[PDB]
């Protein structure tokens, strides 16, 4: 039967095989290069590379969040006492007067002698937290009769182009700093030699990661989400000031409490997991929003003062933004430390491989080299169109930053893009290994990839990076086409 049916089946029913060539691999998401579309704006919950933390030396005593903020503001009394605003940038639908009034209320509540971080439900606080904006539920019959009640047209994420601030964030978050934010707890003493090897390797790995800016940003996110979840459960019908706080340690062992701003929590009656609580964030920064205005459409910025870090003083602005979060986002932010693992396990694996090739532990050789082996280097980036190499620790930091951005900018768009681009990556790897890959519908796979590139900054930057790396791979393969030929 099968033979007869195939005989009488139309030839148009075909898998249409097509041998894959480097030329057939075109850049993904061309629309990200046209300038008609706006550049993707900054939409992360908190500032990452533009964050400015007010540092107060601490004696190791975690007194309280409100007390910590009070001490930090007392140290920087000039910023705290700033009462007249100088508006630098304003969001399209924001009320700068109400935002400044809410900021002043937060500062006063934090600085007051009272031990409660509650804010009164004033007009400006009510506007900022979106009080009384839910639609009234009416009966089915009245709505059916009412001809003005129609199904709302869905809002689709808009299309944006590549923005340089994503590349700047990637560059800055993977650089080493002088502050350690990780607070890893102790483990049991090592007995087995494998445990000693693990501890010795952890020395290098944790030293590399802990000193990078991405680690501090991750710790800030984790702590803020923990505090926000606790406040949302505890204070459902209250407006609460939640300071954005972190704890860092200098290379000399001295600890500092860092205040990055203040957050206002709206009413938190989150019955469902996707129910939204509004958070109004006021974050200190040294970045002038006018250097690139396309990055801050969502932020109302006031210039609140100045600070001294060297002979030259630096301005201090207050980035104010209305934002939202749900219980799922808070829970997943409380456990962002897992990013570490995803970065370590990868690099760790590489080290292990080298050990198997050398007969001894190669962590020290990989990180810094030894008498017999030179340091291991990875293609890390481009400088004026030329490939650049970097150390093992630099690659580890880059992967950790990649995981952190997966968390920060993670949504359905990133998931779909990751899956489809993973398929394309497997095809590219098959091409590199001279396995003669074949495809059936390459345009379909490209359309699947590009359906997910709408406005996620990380997805757009990933498409740009994929295009650059694909061009470099084509250039490299051009030399592989003249072997035994």
């Amino acid at each position: 039967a099968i033979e007869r049916n195939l005989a009488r089946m139309s030839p148009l029913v075909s898998v249409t095989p097509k041998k894959l060539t480097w030329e057939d691999l075109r850049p993904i998401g061309p629309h990200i290069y046209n300038h008609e579309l706006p550049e993707v704006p900054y939409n992360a919950f908190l500032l990452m590379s533009d964050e400015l933390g007010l540092a107060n030396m601490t004696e190791g005593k975690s007194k309280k969040p409100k007390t910590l903020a009070k001490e930090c503001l007392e140290k920087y009394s000039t910023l705290r006492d700033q009462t007249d605003p100088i508006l630098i940038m304003k969001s399209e639908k924001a009320n700068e007067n109400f935002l400044w009034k809410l900021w002043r209320d937060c500062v006063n509540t934090i600085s007051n002698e009272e031990m409660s971080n509650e804010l009164q439900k004033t007009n400006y606080a009510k506007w900022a937290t979106g009080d009384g904006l839910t639609y009234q539920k009416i009966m089915k019959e009245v709505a059916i009769d009412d001809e003005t009640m129609c199904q709302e047209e869905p809002k689709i994420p808009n299309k944006c182009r590549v923005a340089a601030w994503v590349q700047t964030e990637m560059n800055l978050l993977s650089t080493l700093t002088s502050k350690r934010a990780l607070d890893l707890p102790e483990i049991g003493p090592d007995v087995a030699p494998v445990e000693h090897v693990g501890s010795e390797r952890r020395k290098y790995f944790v030293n590399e990661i802990n000193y990078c800016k991405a680690s501090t940003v991750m710790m800030k996110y984790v702590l803020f989400h923990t505090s926000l979840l606790n406040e949302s459960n505890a204070s459902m019908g209250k407006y609460k000031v939640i300071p954005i706080t972190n704890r860092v340690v200098n290379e000399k062992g001295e600890s500092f409490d860092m205040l990055y701003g203040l957050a206002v929590k709206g009413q938190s009656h989150l019955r469902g997991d996707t129910d939204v609580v509004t958070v109004v964030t006021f974050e200190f920064s040294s970045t002038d929003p006018r250097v690139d205005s396309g990055k801050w459409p969502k932020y109302t910025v006031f210039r609140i003062g100045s600070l001294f870090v060297s002979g030259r003083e630096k301005s201090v602005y207050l980035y104010c933004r209305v934002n939202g979060t749900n219980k799922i986002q808070m829970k997943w932010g409380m456990e962002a430390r897992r990013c570490l693992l995803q970065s370590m396990q990868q690099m760790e694996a590489i080290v292990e491989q080298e050990s198997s090739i050398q007969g001894y532990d190669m962590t020290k050789a990989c990180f810094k080299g030894d008498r017999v082996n030179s340091p291991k280097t990875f293609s890390i980036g481009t400088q004026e169109g030329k490939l650049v190499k970097g150390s093992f620790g630099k690659a580890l930091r880059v992967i950790f930053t990649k995981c952190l951005m997966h968390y920060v900018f993670g949504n359905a768009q990133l998931e779909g893009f990751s899956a489809e681009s993973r398929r394309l990556l497997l095809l590219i790897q098959a091409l590199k290994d001279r396995k003669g890959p074949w495809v059936f519908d390459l345009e379909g796979m490209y359309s699947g990839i590009e359906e997910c590139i709408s406005n996620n900054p990380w997805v757009i930057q990933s498409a740009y990076w994929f295009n650059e790396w694909l061009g470099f791979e084509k250039e490299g393969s051009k030399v592989l086409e003249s072997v035994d030929e």
């Binding site: 030699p193 494998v194 001279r434």
Partner: protein
């Protein structure tokens, strides 16, 4: 409290609804209403826990005197609600810090398995940690040790008898064997105030076995599976010595595996006897020398006897077939693969043993003499003993002989493969199959007149002596000194060979206990992939010196100990032909001055064995060189292979998944050199692929080509070329 239960039942029966539920719900349907729940269970318990821990009183309290001991508040913190009382985690902490002090006997009793686990970990020694390739195989292994192991049904029956004898049901005969044990348990739990379900699950932990598919490498005993996470990874090994005691069966299996590995490594060496002795003297089974293990254990296989002879011990010609103890008396057998038709009609590949053999057979208490021939059980003389043991021994002997009747006596379902596709020993599968259904085997075997001699009497299938008995079986009322030769063959004083290296089984098995070799060349005892990776790593390490010797020297570079170890994983049939081919290819590469480093590295190890050329004086031509074990263990002459691949663009050599760099140890001009000059012996690239010659020629076509004639060759897809002799 029977009267209290009766009163409670009456009070419940006062309620009309409870009355109708009790009257209309059957005992079978109880299991339904036990699960009756009005609301769906909340999802995402991680988020739910993170959310609830921020509440005031998320925990439920058990009303009683103990609950009332908890104060309403403690230093300004409300521990409990002032319906269902609820408390906060602070209440748990308060109880832990100021609560009443109770007795801890119940915890110690219930969790004795975990305390034994802790003791096993504590009384353990840790050896060195080695870095190198580790080949791990996924096998079904036991997770935790058990003093007594029974299947879940038997364990459940035993638990029911121990804890709930009243409502136990039918006294299954399968519990008979454990009756004594039950009493013991009923002695220990006579006055225990612990909830019966916790004790039942303690008993299940102590009895029921948990077997899982895990990746292991050389240590499958449950004591080693507990530490599996620390024993090894994919690139490192950790020597571990668990505490406690180990079974004799595990030691016997481990020493059998060790002896087989030692013999396999030694046979390919010059003077195999000396190398075998040297390796055996440095072998340790877990934490005991191999020599001591061989001396102590009364058993083993051919390899164990060979190693005993090499070490100066006395050979023990003993064999185990699950529940049989067979001691050789005379005769020699040879195992040959053959396709046998089973009674079910499915053909199976089985290793049939030929020749005539005499065995002293023991099983439990039953003893006998077994006279066996090829595919036929000739005779079996038995002495009176326990009837059950007698019949079990009879059926075990019948299955062992591989008689045609036994193969034809199968009527049912037999699984010779597991769910993972791994092969199961057909002989043991048949033994297990016929152990529980010996009636069909006896019926198919046949019967004959019972012997009428003075001391010879037969036995029928009815479990008793009778005038009718199954063919062959007859009831009756009634050390060797050898020298091992150079090639690991044992010979009697008369000179007849009783054992040899070829008689050692080629099956690769995972030792139950960890085996160590206190020699720098321990890696030579590894699997095929580990040996290949280590050999190629060594070749890469000494690449410059090997190149220098090759360009200056002619044949001295082909002899090394690393290549000797590599030769053990090349099947002996193809070793000489591979060596001839590789030597010819390397010589042609050197003489013609067209040298490719990647191919030189790939083919150098194969040049160790003495060459074996064709009858016409030319070497064999190959497309791939196959290695022992698995279908993925081969080296491709032209293209890459799962074990060996080269990337000229990046100049990266991938060996068994590990990437190494040839940068520096390479000449860029080699990228402009053709691969066609280093794929066939005596062939050199003549020019472009000429369509006139036609289709590409095969290996057999190449071998028959006369000297000086061209041929079209496909190095790999999209890269044709024409070569000449």
């Amino acid at each position: 409290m029977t009267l209290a239960k009766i009163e409670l039942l009456k009070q419940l029966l006062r309620d009309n609804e409870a009355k109708t539920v009790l009257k209309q719900t059957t005992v079978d349907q109880y299991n339904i209403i036990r699960k009756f729940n009005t609301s769906r269970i909340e999802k995402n318990p991680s988020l739910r826990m993170k959310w609830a821990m921020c509440s005031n009183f998320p925990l439920a309290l058990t009303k009683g005197d103990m609950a009332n001991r908890i104060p309403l508040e403690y230093k300004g913190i409300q521990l409990k609600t002032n319906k269902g009382q609820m408390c906060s985690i602070a209440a748990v902490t308060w109880w832990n810090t100021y609560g009443p002090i109770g007795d801890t006997e119940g915890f110690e009793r219930v969790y004795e398995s975990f305390f034994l686990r802790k003791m096993r970990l504590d009384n353990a020694t840790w050896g060195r940690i080695t870095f190198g390739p580790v080949e791990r195989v996924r096998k079904r292994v036991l997770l935790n040790p058990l003093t007594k192991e029974m299947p879940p049904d038997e364990a459940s029956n035993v638990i029911m008898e121990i804890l709930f004898p009243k409502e136990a049901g039918i006294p299954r005969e399968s519990t008979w064997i454990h009756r004594e044990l039950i009493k013991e348990k009923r002695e220990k739990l006579k006055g225990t105030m612990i909830t019966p379900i916790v004790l039942a699950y303690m008993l299940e932990r102590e009895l029921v076995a948990r077997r899982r598919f895990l990746p292991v490498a050389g240590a499958t005993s449950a004591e080693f599976i507990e530490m599996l996470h620390c024993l090894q990874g994919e690139n490192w090994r950790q020597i571990y010595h668990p505490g406690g005691n180990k079974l004799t069966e595990s030691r016997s299996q481990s020493m059998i595996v060790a002896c087989r590995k030692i013999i396999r490594r030694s046979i390919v060496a010059s003077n195999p006897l000396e190398l075998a002795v040297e390796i055996a003297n440095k072998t340790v089974i877990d934490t005991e020398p191999l020599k001591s293990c061989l001396a102590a254990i009364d058993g083993g296989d051919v390899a164990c006897d060979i190693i005993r002879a090499a070490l100066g011990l006395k050979i023990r010609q003993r064999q185990r077939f699950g529940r049989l103890e067979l001691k050789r008396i005379s005769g020699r057998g040879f195992k040959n693969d053959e396709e046998i038709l089973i009674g079910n009609g499915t053909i199976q590949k089985i290793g049939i043993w030929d020749g005539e053999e005499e065995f002293h057979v023991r099983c439990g208490e039953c003893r006998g003499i077994l006279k066996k021939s090829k595919m036929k059980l000739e005779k079996l003389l038995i002495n009176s003993a326990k009837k059950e043991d007698m019949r079990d021994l009879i059926i075990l002997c019948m299955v062992f002989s591989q008689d045609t009747r036994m193969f034809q006596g199968v009527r049912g379902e037999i699984n010779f493969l597991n769910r993972a596709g791994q092969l199961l020993s057909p002989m043991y599968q048949l033994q297990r199959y016929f152990l529980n259904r010996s009636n069909d085997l006896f019926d198919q075997w046949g019967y004959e007149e019972s012997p009428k001699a003075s001391e010879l009497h037969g036995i029928n299938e009815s479990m008793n002596a009778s005038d009718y008995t199954l063919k062959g079986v007859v009831v009756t009322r009634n050390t060797e000194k050898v020298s091992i030769t150079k090639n690991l063959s044992l010979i009697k004083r008369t000179g007849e060979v009783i054992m040899g290296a070829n008689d050692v089984s080629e099956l690769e098995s995972q030792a139950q206990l960890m085996i160590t070799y206190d020699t720098p060349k321990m890696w030579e005892m590894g699997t095929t992939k580990e040996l290949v990776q280590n050999t190629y790593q060594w070749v890469l390490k000494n690449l410059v010196t090997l190149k220098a010797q090759f360009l200056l020297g002619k044949e001295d570079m082909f002899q090394w100990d690393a290549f000797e170890a590599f030769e053990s994983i090349i099947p002996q049939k193809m070793a000489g032909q591979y060596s001839g081919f590789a030597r010819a290819v390397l010589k042609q590469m050197r003489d013609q001055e067209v040298m490719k480093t990647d191919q030189f590295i790939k083919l150098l190890p194969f040049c160790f064995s003495p060459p074996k050329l064709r009858s016409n004086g030319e070497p064999y031509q190959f497309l791939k060189l196959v290695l022992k074990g698995g279908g993925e263990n081969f080296i491709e002459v032209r293209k890459g292979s799962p074990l060996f691949s080269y990337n000229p663009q990046t100049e990266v050599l991938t060996i068994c998944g590990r990437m190494m760099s040839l940068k520096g140890k390479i000449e860029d001009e080699e990228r402009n050199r053709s691969m066609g000059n280093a794929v066939l012996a005596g062939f050199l690239v003549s020019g472009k692929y000429d369509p006139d010659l036609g289709d590409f020629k095969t290996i057999e076509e190449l071998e028959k080509l006369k000297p000086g004639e061209k041929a079209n060759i496909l190095l790999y897809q999209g890269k044709p070329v024409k070569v000449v002799k």
